[PDB]
Design a protein around this ligand. Sequence first.
Ligand SMILES: Nc1ncnc2c1ncn2[C@@H]1O[C@H](COP(=O)(O)OP(=O)(O)O)[C@@H](O)[C@H]1O
Ligand SMILES: Nc1ncnc2c1ncn2[C@@H]1O[C@H](COP(=O)(O)OP(=O)(O)O)[C@@H](O)[C@H]1O
Ligand code: BEF
Ligand SMILES: [Cl-]
Ligand SMILES: [Cl-]
Ligand SMILES: [Cl-]
Ligand SMILES: [Mg+2]
Ligand SMILES: [Mg+2]
Lengths: 540, 649
Amino acid sequence: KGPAVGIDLGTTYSCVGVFQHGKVEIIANDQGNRTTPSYVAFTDTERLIGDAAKNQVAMNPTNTVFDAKRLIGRRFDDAVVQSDMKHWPFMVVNDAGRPKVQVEYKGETKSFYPEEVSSMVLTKMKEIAEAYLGKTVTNAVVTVPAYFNDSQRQATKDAGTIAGLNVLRIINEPTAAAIAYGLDKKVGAERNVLIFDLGGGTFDVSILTIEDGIFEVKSTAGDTHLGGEDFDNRMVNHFIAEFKRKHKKDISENKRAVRRLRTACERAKRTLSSSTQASIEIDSLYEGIDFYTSITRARFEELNADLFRGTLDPVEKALRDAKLDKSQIHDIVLVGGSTRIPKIQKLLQDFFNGKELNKSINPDEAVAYGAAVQAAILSGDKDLLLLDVTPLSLGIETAGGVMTVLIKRNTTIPTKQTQTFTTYSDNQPGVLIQVYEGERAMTKDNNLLGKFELTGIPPAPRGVPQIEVTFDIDANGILNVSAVDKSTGKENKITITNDKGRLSKEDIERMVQEAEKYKAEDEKQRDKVSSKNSLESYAF
Amino acid sequence: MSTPFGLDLGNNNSVLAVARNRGIDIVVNEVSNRSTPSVVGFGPKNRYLGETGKNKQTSNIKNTVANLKRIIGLDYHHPDFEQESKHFTSKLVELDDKKTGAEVRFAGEKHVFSATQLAAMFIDKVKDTVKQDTKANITDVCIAVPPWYTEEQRYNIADAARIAGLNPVRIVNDVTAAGVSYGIFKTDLPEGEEKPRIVAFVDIGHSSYTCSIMAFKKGQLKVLGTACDKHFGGRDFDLAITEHFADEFKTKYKIDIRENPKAYNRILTAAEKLKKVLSANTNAPFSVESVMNDVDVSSQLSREELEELVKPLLERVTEPVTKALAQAKLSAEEVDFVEIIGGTTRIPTLKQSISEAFGKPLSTTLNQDEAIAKGAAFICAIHSPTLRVRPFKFEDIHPYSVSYSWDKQVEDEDHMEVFPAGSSFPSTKLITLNRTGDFSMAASYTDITQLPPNTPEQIANWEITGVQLPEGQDSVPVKLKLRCDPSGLHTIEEAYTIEDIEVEEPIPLPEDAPEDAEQEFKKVTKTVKKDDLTIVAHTFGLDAKKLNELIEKENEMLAQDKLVAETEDRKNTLEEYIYTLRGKLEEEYAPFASDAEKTKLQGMLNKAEEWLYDEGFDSIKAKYIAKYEELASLGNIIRGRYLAKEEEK
Ligand SMILES: Nc1ncnc2c1ncn2[C@@H]1O[C@H](COP(=O)(O)OP(=O)(O)O)[C@@H](O)[C@H]1O
Ligand SMILES: Nc1ncnc2c1ncn2[C@@H]1O[C@H](COP(=O)(O)OP(=O)(O)O)[C@@H](O)[C@H]1O
Ligand code: BEF
Ligand SMILES: [Cl-]
Ligand SMILES: [Cl-]
Ligand SMILES: [Cl-]
Ligand SMILES: [Mg+2]
Ligand SMILES: [Mg+2]
């Protein structure tokens, strides 16, 4: 017993997926949370990973480590690690060339490498997988950003193994996501694909090229500190405007009141991706005063006009660096929760000229999705549950008012069926295809759904001409009925304007039974006529 | 071609699932959460439904209705009404039917709504939540309820679904929906010919604790025993704590918080939040701003203290586990695994307190938030006329003995036990009654002392019509089809007369070949359906008249909301158009608009700007597109001589 999980080790929250039942299941933690925070917090008693840690930050800020992803496998005196050492309210020492974080575990001093912090995060992700899955978990595919270099990309695979994982393969965040939507499985040609990864605080455009499901990483653009949390800020600011104005009091000095106004704006923000208005109502914000206001979406998009539109920039700088024009990107993929902002999509879609955006899969966890698919493929993959089918026998009318079925009831959908018919009289010009639904043998007890004509058959003797009706249903249940003349190639069809709305399984079962109660005289009615063939636009 | 929707109607929050793309997904709502809050609240211009309702919890506290699922079928004078209203916030009042309902200030006026009608309101919202995410059509629903729900409340909550315009393919016992989850996913259950796997499921949610034990095999679950404590859930822990702090703020503060609605309520909400936090940490800060007299409160609680608080609850835990094994006629080591689902099984002391109640480790292999809902939508799919589902058979437990009675005409007896205690459902029973004519039938509990206090005993009754005697016969046998349906509901599914006739058949004798002659025929009596009879059902379900009534109110209330929101859409299309127009007069239209043309608007945007600050902050839909019209008049024009002049040029 021993399955293959896929893990997204992200900067602030890691996700873990497993591929079971045709689709990826994303595992929740023992607190209900699908994503788990990348925080380890050392204290006296013991250490704390994930939510436990992030809960007690601000009561241990100088001991609750985070963003270890921002320095895994790198040099202390690094270009970017220098800028970084700034915020982290924890110590960042040097142990001969490399970075190492330093803490109070059990009261005094100890210091752990990045790969060690990151590794004890995976341990929890491991644990979380193990809980849900029943057996133990060893094989994992762990992800990293396209722009990682072999050293940090390696230290990541170390975190893995230090955590007892057998890191089957390290893979790109952008390529994991393209995997999830299974573009590396779309018909030939060479494919260009743009991932548009907008987190809560990192942004990342990446352009990949795929032939035969092999992932060639063309170019990466982005922005280190851009996402959700930023659009929040605009709102917070904007509302302190409003509160200070409408109340003369200014809250800016209140580490709690600013927090509560923040929580509220993020909620409103999320609301504004679905609604066009939102509302903020904090009971007793400052000095006992109540803040209740609204905010419109256009007002929201306005506070971030500069920020949103600016996401188009790493697009042009990735489109360029990768020597490609905007119309050479075949697929676009939204990843990260900020990509839910209608306006950000609105901007991205128009930029690419109305092209559609891949975003079915919760962006929150598209990457972990892709990784969980991989760990499958890399482990041998580790009946069908549900099948779409047809409610009622479909067919056309034949000489007599008979019903000749083309598609038996309860046929497995995406289906194509074809039966050759002939003409009823001689020198017959054209046929009248009448499509019927129903389980009776006489089209007079069935339901007309539509009709069209094939005209201009070479006049010939009653029985020669080879008319060739086909019923086609796509996955959606759209029905095209088409007649083609074998002789000439003349062809007409119709796409049945559906109607579905509706009959319920009971209805069908009562229809099915009526047709069983009449089998006798229904059968002995087309068992006295003899011919399967259509009449010259002689309806009835 | 429309989607199966299963709804898990939990007291705190619902989880919407749909069957689609050959699997079952969960639907996320407008604020991107994977569960809507089961709250209905009322504005002065619209209703606040689901996610919104919760916001307002503190503003609109008086016209906010939650506990939706517990006031369904609640008798207003029920000896326990206490325990339910304890948890309420809006005023509850008796109705014509002696049942519970809610008084709320809404669209200016007082309104009174029944639990059925309130529940119809929420269900409509989430129906919409799903409609929009599916982009597709939504009709059939399978809903999940506590196993404790009565045959009444099962009917009520189904009639709810009807008001919000969904057809309830099945009312399912929730933990059994989790069982179907389990059964249809887990991958090497025993073979039909092997001994089954006994899995106990324990779901402590916001208000109800339930423990039922089932036997699984590939394609098969049978529920062996179920036992509930319907007054044991997260909400009872939330009080437990809220009460501890209430004592403190009587002491080192002297405010009796139990003096203020708004106050008690904000401490509650905060108690809840703290509690969730101690499920992951050992210590937790606690603080609420301006509880009463501009006072700020600040305290904390340790896990040890949290647990010390709840020992009362921790001691009512094993009770239903014992009752369950007892009923399932099982011993605890015969149970192979014990799977926990439900929000409040996340508290570690509770995790343990149940482990030692079964005497083995807990297992957690179901998604313990989405299993009841996910399985529920599978079931809905079963009933989909446009789906072929993986075959799966499930029988639930039918705890109470139910007999059926009938006009004793030519019959010796006028009743019999039909569905014994401890049998499974659904179950169909064929009977044959001898009939001198039309007659009446009724279903009821065999031993009313078995059921919870004040359970009627009469369950339903029907009248059968159209009985017609052959010819020379004084009586006629009618075959009835009594059925305990998949929702647990006791019905009479079909009734018809039968009659004998003589079907002359030939006699063979192809042994000899006696000059070819001596063909004999025998008269043969063949029993045959005669007439189909008519059944009028009289159940807890609502009549077509009162239904369409309740339905037309939900139809109005719904369409007054749909205007209230269709209005603020234009208020935004305007506002957005304003910004995006000034922002392109410079970024695109400077080279393309005239110069005298620019002071035509600029400009005209600006009146239309402060327009949105009194007349109207909230105008009428008419005017939000009104202003949009004449503003767009000057748009296009410019915008176009730009587009056709750079596009090709
Ligand atoms: N419907 C939504 N609309 C707008 N923003 C959202 C929505 N859902 C989530 N977000 C934002 O996405 C951010 C996090 O998304 P995610 O891609 O998971 O990155 P992170 O790893 O920071 O969570 C949060 O700041 C949150 O505000
Ligand atoms: N991590 C947690 N620790 C303790 N209790 C929790 C946790 N998460 C949720 N709960 C509690 O469980 C309840 C919600 O569980 P749920 O089963 O969804 O309720 P229902 O099914 O009755 O709607 C809430 O009262 C909540 O306070
Ligand atoms: F719906 Be919950 F699980 F009670
Ligand atoms: Cl291509
Ligand atoms: Cl900012
Ligand atoms: Cl989504
Ligand atoms: Mg990242
Ligand atoms: Mg509950």
